[model samples]
Target chain A: KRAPYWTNTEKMEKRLHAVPAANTVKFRCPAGGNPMPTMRWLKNGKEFKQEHRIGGYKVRNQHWSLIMESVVPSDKGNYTCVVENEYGSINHTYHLDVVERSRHRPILQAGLPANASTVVGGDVEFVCKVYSDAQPHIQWIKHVYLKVLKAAGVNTTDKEIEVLYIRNVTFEDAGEYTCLAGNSIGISFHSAWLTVL
Target chain B: FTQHVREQSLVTDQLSRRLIRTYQLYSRTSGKHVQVLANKRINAMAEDGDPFAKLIVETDTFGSRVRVRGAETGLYICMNKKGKLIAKSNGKGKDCVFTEIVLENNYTALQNAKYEGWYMAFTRKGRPRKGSKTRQHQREVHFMKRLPR
Candidate 1:
């Protein structure tokens, strides 16, 4: 007997999906095994069997596919694809955060440093990631003498990206900075500091 | 048998029949179950009976070393060489094994067999603490064994 393993974890990277309400989404499990493993879908730790169902979800003819139509707020949770054989088992999971379009507020994720120190004539970049149903406008402002400048602006694709890049740092570049993100309804911000040595 | 088990547990067992026990690990920090997610994420954020919280403990040594995995996700709690906690399907490696330390307070601490002093730990917010920064005396490394409901 052989164990089961996921086949497509890199090329088809799985990430948290901030799916808009009332929209459709699908996931396909790329898995392989010896003697072939049996596949099943689960939500919140419970198997998505015929007797156990929620949301407008459909199981594909192939056991590895899952399609959810007209997603609702209640459908926001962990979804897993589990496969097993005699020797062992393996699985994949997807996190879905249902976004309410009309009242969405930008939620800052990770990749922002609280305090950064760089030597003179050095360059530093701050990657700011935000999660929202709608694309948000990002602004980076320096608290040093209340200096205002443009960092990097991005508003494309299903993902919103903004980067604060400062090059050839000088002593005057040492200060606290803020990344403010906002949408049509609300706003959120994060602050950090940069020290030039 | 104190020294006997400690000395015996230092070595991985293969000749003896491995025992697979079903249980949960209650994190002292989060006051929740330690769960291994399918995405190689480990956290102490699972509520009671959470599918990912259902762990299968496999005895790796006759004494106290064991391999932990999510019963539903089938991902092992593995501490990499760099002291980062991750999940992997293949758990036969020694890196996937952890030596269980039952403390004087009756709480348990899991130190990776491969990382020596590094421990498996989580923060008060349920985020995983870098194993390299953890110690056996820290609250983040303390856990209680629980039976799933």
Candidate 2:
């Protein structure tokens, strides 16, 4: 008796990478044998049964397909298709990688002080924390009456934290400083007033 | 004889496998988390909670073997036969197999299955360590898993 083997082993071995929240993902497994093989799909080594978001479809008696709908981040893992005949069995493994999509726009996480008072000879820091799925670019801008002033001490070395350091605060340093965070998805801003004495 | 049975049991006990988890590996020597950048650079300089540091770990076998991939970059953390850790596009080769060992200090060490006894290690500056020069007890090879927030 001959062991069942995959007709497309090379394609089946390739890992599949999909974006999270994708509409649908399908895997095809076709095998050949003398007495016909029973097909089963296993996810992470366990039997994978059909659920609301997942289903199995058989095609031409020798080809088996596993379809996933509304794919979430948790749906990503190793999927193995096993085929067994009375003589022997064979299996093929595929890796599924799901990249998370930017769900929410940039939002401030912390360090938004309403107002701050500092002496002219003292130093102050305006920190803004932001959270986003995608890396957010941060900028510190000073709001003036008819023009926007750019701050000189904007440190965006860290994606989650942005700091506007004012060394030896001067009269001109007093203004409404806006911390702007933006990404491909959208942008967000938080403003705080600084009074130099 | 016992060693033979242990190895055989590892392959046969496939149903009672562990669950796959996604997390970041914090290097003890580098003081940074491992990352797979979009540019395909594999390093250990990613800060805490960085998206590049996120990793998806899959159990390759019922034993301690596992395959790790970047959650954002979609690259697999693989070590070449020559013992170089590189971010590979696919993880189907033997170079991608890593045996996870939980040390006595509760830290995890990943030794390449392809180059047995050769570990995936990094220097204090987060540079990759040559497999020929690495040892399992070295601090540069210790890593701790940090769950994403």
Candidate 3:
């Protein structure tokens, strides 16, 4: 390409975005040109100078992506991406709106279930229930063998309730376990131990 | 010779003078800076300018190989046999060494010297990702250098 021009115009062409407060958002610009155009970002038509400061400001280059972590009301504004080469230059602009987030965080209201024991070749289940106004990513952990659950392909996927069921219990399956729930706001975890008889 | 230089980078530099640089690694998807905690856990979700976010990088070879340690915690970044990124008080082994590969998009990939193809990486939540699961072209392994704010 002789002159700098946008190839994936639609990807970076969005004019508006709505993100909850404390959430992370990223705007990416994907394009190419001869000499590999140098890219920069502008907030409200001025240089976005918070790259190295707090508020999680970063401009990365898989061809120029602007990321903001833990966004607040003050972060709402216009953002422009400019790419330049000696031949010519191209640009794209967008606006971001930071909305207030739910005040509630993930809570293990019912609390982590009590530990239980299972006989060899038998099964056991550890159940957990979490309440939250915000979305939560839930994961279960077997402490001693960190990735054993993955090896056994055992998992419980749910929005509020989690049941980690281990079948054909063996000696190696006895260990401390944890239930981890987290989202953009924070993380909550609880641990307990299991026994094999 | 480029081939000779490549071999030289594989071994420790015994006689060459070294360079030290101070900076923070901006994790792309994590949207935060990499930090080594006092307890020796390495994570990439630290806020910019946080004391633990400061990293002292020492260039031991003429190539892109360097040793990265925490300015606040005094812990060095290292990779274990399980492809886990950890922080250790002592960094004498090759496990703590990393080769910095600059990508075409201008991001830098930190590949562990001991683990070879395994790269230092993190998840969107800023937690450490398994190095074995990372690739050179993946954004999880991409990082940007920023001044300590």
Best by DockQ: 3
Model 1 misplacement above 4 A = A1-197, B1-10
Residues B30-132 of candidate 2: C-alpha lDDT, one tens digit per residue: 7678898988888887776799999987655433467789999889988876778889887887688777765554456887878887988888777888888
Provide the lDDT at B58 for model 3: 69
lDDT of 2 by residue, A1-197 (tens): 67787777544633433234554666777887878888878888998865523444333343477767666767878788788999898887766555444444568865583568898989888777766543334456577632333333222323355456778989987888876654334567788999998
Better of 2 and 3 by lDDT: 3
Error of 1 at B15 (Å): 1.7
Which stretch of 10 consecutive residues in model 2 chain A shows the poorest summed lDDT? A146-155
Worst 10 residues of 1 chain A by lDDT: A10-19
What is the iRMSD of the candidate numbered 1?
A: 25.2
Q: What fraction of the reference structure's interface contacts does model 2 contain?
A: 0.00
**Could you list the chain B TM-scores for each candidate?**
0.91, 0.87, 0.94
DockQ by candidate, in order? 0.01, 0.02, 0.03
Q: How does each model score on lDDT?
A: 0.70, 0.67, 0.71
Clashes of each: 0, 0, 0
Q: What is the lDDT, from 0 to 100, of the residue A56 in candidate 3?
A: 51
User: Which residue pairs does candidate 3 place in steric collision?
Assistant: none
